[PDB]
Amino acid sequence: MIQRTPKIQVYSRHPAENGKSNFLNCYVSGFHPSDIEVDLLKNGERIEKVEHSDLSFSKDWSFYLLYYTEFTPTEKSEYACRVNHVTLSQPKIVKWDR
């Protein structure tokens, strides 16, 4: 058996075809087992309609998840990614560094 703690990155990207669009991304990488819970948060509340959840693996024991959706950030709100995994004794909340 092997278990590996996810690395968690939270960032925004504008698709080059539409600069008015902005995506909030949680990139959860290098984890095992594949069991996981990932949410995007706005002001600590789970964002319910996340448009994209892309799972892959490299080696049989390394998984990668890109979890992302359209958003319109303001100065008045806080955005984050929350991850639960067996390797994490408490939920890990990673704030967006703008």
Residue numbers in the entry: 0 to 97
Could you give the paper's own sentences about this structure?
β2m is 99 residues in length (10.8 kDa) and has a seven-stranded β-sandwich immunoglobulin fold that is stabilized by a single disulphide bond linking Cys25 and Cys80 (31, 32). Another example is β2m, in which aggregation of the wild-type (WT) protein is associated with the deposition of amyloid fibrils in the joints of patients undergoing long-term renal dialysis (dialysis-related amyloidosis [DRA]). More recently, two single-point variants of this protein, D76N and V27M, have been identified in amyloid deposits in the viscera or tongue, respectively, with the former occurring in the absence of kidney disease.
Comparison of the crystal structures of D76E-, D76A-, D76S-, D76G-, D76Q-, D76Y-, and D76K-β2m with those of WT- and D76N-β2m revealed no substantial differences that could explain their different stabilities and aggregation propensities (RMSD < 0.6 Å over all heavy atoms). For D76N-β2m, the network of hydrogen bonds involving the sidechains of N42, T73, and Y78 found in the CD and EF loops of WT-β2m is maintained in the variant. Six substitutions are observed at residue 76 (Ala, His, Asn, Ser, Thr, and Val). Interestingly, saturation mutagenesis of residue 76 showed that these six substitutions are among those that have the least effect on the in vivo growth score and on protein stability compared with Asp76.
